[PDB]
Amino acid sequence: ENTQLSEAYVDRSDVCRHDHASAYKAHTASLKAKVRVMYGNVNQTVDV
Amino acid sequence: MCVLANATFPCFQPPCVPCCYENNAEATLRMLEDNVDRPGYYDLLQAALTCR
Amino acid sequence: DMTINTCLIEQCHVSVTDHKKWQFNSPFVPRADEPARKGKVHIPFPLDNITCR
Ligand SMILES: *[C@@H]1O[C@H](CO)[C@@H](O[C@@H]2O[C@H](CO)[C@@H](O[C@@H]3O[C@H](CO)[C@@H](O)[C@H](O)[C@@H]3O)[C@H](O)[C@H]2NC(C)=O)[C@H](O)[C@H]1NC(C)=O
Numbered sequence: 692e693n694t695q696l697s698e699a700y701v702d703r704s705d706v707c708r709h710d711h712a713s714a715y716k717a718h719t720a721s722l723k724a725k726v727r728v729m730y731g732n733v734n735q736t737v738d739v
Numbered sequence: 740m741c742v743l744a745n746a747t748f749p750c751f752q753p754p755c756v757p758c759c760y761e762n763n764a765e766a767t768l769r770m771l772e773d774n775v776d777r778p779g780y781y782d783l784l785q786a787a788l789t790c791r
Numbered sequence: 792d793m794t795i796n797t798c799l800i801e802q803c804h805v806s807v808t809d810h811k812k813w814q815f816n817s818p819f820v821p822r823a824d825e826p827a828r829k830g831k832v833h834i835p836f837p838l839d840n841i842t843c844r
């Protein structure tokens with residue numbers, strides 16, 4: 692005349708903040724560039 | 740923050756100072772076992788288990 | 792010590808209660824009371840960054 696209570700559940704791991712994957716939606720790309728312009732006696736590179 | 744029956748004392752200073760475990764081991768353990776959900780659990784633990 | 796003077800061995804039990812000491816929450820040892828008590832101990836050796844050659 693005895694009884695056992697069995698219990699279990701699941702959790703996020705101890706190091707989930709160091710080793711995890713991210714699922715994204717990506718849209719509307721925007722490109723930067725870096726261009727070097729020279730003429731006369733000016734060199735010099737700008738980021739646009 | 741931490742509570743002992745009806746004490747509600749700051750966790751840095753328990754009412755068992757000094758030698759909480761040396762004076763009463765079982766009472767100290769029961770003291771800790773019911774503040775596990777209290778965010779001041781670890782400093783309470785540090786206070787309960789230190790004395791020279 | 793205690794003496795019964797009445798019956799045989801195969802009727803009484805020794806069940807040491809001991810207490811005073813936290814053990815562990817291990818699936819191979821039972822609980823003593825249902826809603827449980829639970830504690831918290833910090834385990835050593837955390838995970839960190841290095842570089843390999
Ligand atoms: C406009 O400016 C850029 C950067 O200041 C000039 O490019 C640079 O030119 C010099 C001279 O050739 C390079 O120095 C040499 O590089 C070689 C690479 O191996 C090295 O072996 C030499 O010892 C020396 O360091 C420099 O690396 C180079 N920099 C870059 C980012 O390319 C360019 O010549 C200028 N344009 C004009 C028209 O003056």
Ligand SMILES: *[C@@H]1O[C@H](CO)[C@@H](O[C@@H]2O[C@H](CO)[C@@H](O[C@@H]3O[C@H](CO)[C@@H](O)[C@H](O)[C@@H]3O)[C@H](O)[C@H]2NC(C)=O)[C@H](O)[C@H]1NC(C)=O
Pocket residue numbers: 708709838839840
């Ligand atoms: C080993 O190095 C990596 C890279 O630096 C560590 O990952 C970094 O972990 C920190 C946590 O301290 C992250 O900071 C977080 O930033 C967000 C904002 O972006 C903030 O909201 C959080 O509260 C937290 O402070 C950091 O983002 C993350 N680096 C990257 C690129 O995501 C790692 O923790 C180091 N240790 C290990 C792996 O044990």
